[PDB]
């Protein structure tokens, strides 16, 4: 009756990670087909990062200022383009380890795996959520920059995130693989406020369903509620509003457990209003919001 | 200031997982050099599992009863041996994807990554601890059997665990790669009691050091304690005794934070005796014991 926060197998992504340097600045890149992708701030020093003019900085850089490494192999560049906040470095060899892949822009509340790398070398993999305020609560030390987030469907790697910045608050911000930031953030070493963050209500519910499936059902009550009245309580505890789309998305879990989505919401309501009284759910003392309904399904069905 | 439970990159292990079937029974195997390794209970039906005579069951099985698959390739066997609770199936091709590897027997309290597979196909990776009572709190659905646990050092995969059983309580038990069970367990569908489980004290301390490093230090006090008096309290809350070896192992973390191991223990004491008072440490409301001192170092230093 086990339930673990599982990342996707990282093998397809490991063979795509490279090192990218200029000057004192090294970070991680992603080598796909004949293109390396990395944060454009690789071209900056720490002084440049206060107020970088990326256009003007990019004009001063030589191909040969960019040392792309891959293990104990150094690669060579034949064309370079800035797309938003990503640098595309066309290279002298198409990665033979290129998986089938797509680039996707995910929505707040969606999950993905991160392959944390230091210097183009994989160190670890973890599963996380994109927060409603478009930050990531990551584990990123000096030069985990350029580490990517992904989902795997069948044979296809869907790349959705590239780490760019740690905010003064210690949370992470990054871009899609076209180089557009998630959230209001910019690649400048400046004061940048994230929004109020909220809990991903639909994910919490999914995880309560996981808990029922795995045999942990003390929090079930025979109260119910409407969506509208649930959302009154939710809004008070900085939970995201739940929509009928969210209810629809929970239907397979409702079907499996014989527990109506709106009855699970009424359980959650009592949890929010009364706490856990020192009890745990799936071995956790807080309500977990980093499993989507899809994640719970995938893990419960194989 | 992020701290995540990270698994090792799984690529080296993904290219070693295969499917093994007999009858209605399929499960995961590990294909290294010219040998496939899998739980010996692959040769059993669910009826056989009450009281299997593995010697006699093994005598009735034909090579050709064993369908080893690898993606969309089926492999063929030339020799078979039972080593303890593992079957070794010598095969007609040395895995070209074989990494550098070792087989190790780990100690309770040590961590490792599991590549959860269904039918020889990787589904996910997670980090876990071997509990003091030699169970694993896993995520293993029907035929995640034969899924392996591992650590990576540099270029070398150290295989330490193979999942065999779910206990009636829902926890998992398994063997080393020589087929010796961790703990008192046996591969029979019978009533088997795990010990009282305890919390891995040294790991909790390591994680408190992680918390200090990441800026979360409300629980620091200016009390201290002796080891002997700490262990009085620990024993009351079903914490493993802390030894001078454990103190020694925490020295690098003590050095980095300027907090003496015994002062951190006195912090832990107050935590055990008073709870958290609704506060969190590293975003958790319980004390985490699945990070070793080595894990905390590796994550904090790159």
Describe the 3D structure.
Two copies of one chain form a homodimer. Chain A is α+β, with helices and mostly antiparallel strands. Chain A folds into two domains: 11-175, Beta Barrel (Thrombin, subunit H); 201-301, main proteinase (3clpro) structure, domain 3. The first copy, chain A, contains eight helices and 13 strands. Chain A has helices at 11-14, 54-59, 201-213, 227-236, 244-249, 251-257, 261-274, 293-301; strands at residues 17-22, 25-32, 35-39, 69-70, 73-74, 77-83, 86-91, 100-103, 111-117, 122-129, 148-153, 156-166, 172-175. In chain A, α3 runs parallel beside α6 (251-257). The first copy, chain A, is elongated. Chain A binds chain B through residues 1-12, 14-15, 115-116, 118, 122-126, 128, 137-143, 170-172, 214-215, 280, 283-286, 298-302, and chain B through 1-12, 14-15, 115-116, 118, 122-126, 128, 137-143, 170-172, 214-215, 280, 283-286, 298-302.
